[PDB]
Amino acid sequence: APAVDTAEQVYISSLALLKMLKHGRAGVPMEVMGLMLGEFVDDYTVRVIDVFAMPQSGTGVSVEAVDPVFQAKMLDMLKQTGRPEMVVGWYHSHPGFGCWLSGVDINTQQSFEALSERAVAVVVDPIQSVKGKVVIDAFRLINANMMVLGHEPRQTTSNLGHLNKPSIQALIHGLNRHYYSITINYRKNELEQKMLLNLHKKSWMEGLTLQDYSEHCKHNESVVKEMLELAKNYNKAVEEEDKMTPEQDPKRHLEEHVDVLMTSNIVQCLAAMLDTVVFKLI
């Protein structure tokens, strides 16, 4: 009997992740659900090209929460649009509950896997996804007959599936007992990286735009006053150092202050000279 390898990866595209995050935040504090479109490239790869949200239902997040008619018309209209990808799986948001599958989640995942054996149930935490870390895991299932007899849920052929460690919160809620966490990887080509770089790419202007001069003098005065106080502290510390065998430091904070003063002053001076030169009447 074939067994899914532990090296299988869920290749979630960048815009799919963005849409999942935005929809999950939008539904807070409720739970949202949407269907994931993509293609199962092979046994060891699941590619999630795109994901579309679904209307909020009073049931919550269940298999009655996915309605047939909206799903059908959405799929047909996207196929007409240019995205003829089969539904790979479903996603729902556990707001602040961590990433795991509840009993209703497991029931919905069994319903989805009835359609196709390969079907992930990736969930996302919209509020725990604070800037930096993104809390999103993907679980498929564990067949009951598979676990009861004795075999491991997944065959292992490499260290790819063991790079990340499971969480206690997921483990208690049935991880490695009813479902396994599939390693998640983000498909991000150079084009989308460059496009997303425009979010914080300031402009061609601020590289030449001088900061306010009076504000610059006020900032310099403040930092030099801090320099004076920190220099008094450093002198006192050094005077203690001689009466000290090897046994916050003013020196370090002084170093950070001198660094910020240096960069600010040098940047302002160089920018002033450049505006003097290039921004000329001639």
Partner: protein
């Protein structure tokens, strides 16, 4: 003898030059990574945070705090926190989702 020693000498010099270049590049990358890590550590101090009372320090980096939510947690003290300000019953700010003494 002399020529073999001279060969080993410039070979060692070239190896040292390559190591110097590698160390310089790694130093630049490590400065970049240190800046990113410091930014992350500053970002964990963002808002909102739950207020708690610093009950008693256990280690250099861990402590017991009684969060105002009515519960006591054994949490991790941020390194950047100045230690001698961490006195018993002092009001401290805890991370919302981890209760870490932020």
């Amino acid at each position: 003898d002399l020529y073999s020693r001279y060969k080993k000498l410039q070979q060692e010099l070239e190896f040292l030059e390559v190591q110097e270049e590698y160390i310089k590049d790694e130093q630049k990358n490590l400065k970049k990574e240190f800046l990113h890590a410091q930014e992350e550590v500053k970002r964990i101090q963002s808002i909102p945070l739950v207020i708690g009372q610093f009950l008693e320090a256990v280690d250099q980096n861990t402590a017991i705090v009684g969060s105002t939510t009515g519960s006591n947690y054994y949490v991790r003290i941020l390194s950047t926190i100045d230690r001698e300000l961490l006195k018993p019953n002092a009001s401290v700010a805890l991370h919302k989702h981890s209760n870490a003494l932020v």
